Amino acid sequence: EPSSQPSDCGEVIEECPIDACFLPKSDSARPPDCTAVGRPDCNVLPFPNNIGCPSCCPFECSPDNPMFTPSPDGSPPNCSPTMLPSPS
């Protein structure tokens, strides 16, 4: 299906988020992470969307699931856009 995924750096590397989650996640705070509201059933990465989920995102995904701070410029993006100086 995808002939090109590792092209950004780590935004596109088997990463479950993407707009497939619901928008580019770190957009400006997309819908919550399911368990995060009380959907532990949605903690399952492959989305059931047929049992628990009221339209949030799942969990697990990759080694160490914590992710925080949205905004398109919320943090030093790294993987080249941070290499160049743009402090403030």
* Experimental method of this PDB entry: NMR
Token code pair at residue 42: 């949605």
Contact 26, 71 (CB under 8 A): yes
Alpha-carbon distances, residue 82 vs 24, 57, 64, 85, 86 (angstroms): 19, 28, 23, 7, 7
**Is the distance from CB of 18 to CB of 2 less than 8 angstroms?**
no
